[PDB]
């Protein structure tokens, strides 16, 4: 059904979300769960689409969406998975966490349609 949406209307969303499911299913097929890919996920993404991105606007938009999605994924969507808690949860005890996030992995479930 066309009214269902989330098929072509949101090209940026579909283009970004596909990166998550495709890259995850690929690595789980190889190993199981690579994890640890905050900047890496965006990094390879940009390097893959940079050839089709002939306009600065596109890149800025793609990076905005990819970043927003990851940020949402780790919060609003809450489809992210982490091993520990005390090493990734700021405030309360006043954890350091100045280096980087311990373990970061995403659930292949999500809430997209496509």
């Amino acid at each position: 059904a066309p009214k269902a949406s989330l098929r072509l209307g949101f090209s940026e969303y579909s283009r970004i979300s596909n990166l998550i499911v495709l890259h995850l299913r690929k690595v789980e097929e190889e190993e199981d769960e690579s994890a640890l890919k905050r900047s890496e996920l965006v990094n390879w993404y940009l390097k893959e689409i940079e050839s089709e991105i002939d306009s600065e606007e596109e890149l800025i938009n793609k990076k905005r969406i990819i970043e927003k999605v990851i940020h949402r994924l780790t919060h609003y969507d809450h489809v992210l998975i982490e091993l520990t808690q005390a090493g990734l949860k700021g405030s309360t005890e006043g954890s350091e966490s100045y280096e980087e996030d311990p373990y970061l992995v995403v659930n292949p479930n999500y809430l997209l349609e496509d």
């Binding site: 965006v42 600065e56 800025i60 990076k63 927003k68």
Partner: peptide
Amino acid sequence: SALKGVSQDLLERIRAKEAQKQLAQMTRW
């Protein structure tokens, strides 16, 4: 070209990208 560059760290790569498509003609022949 854009207001409030989201994630300057990831977007900084664009400052060099703009130069790339500047010296190299990407215009479809």
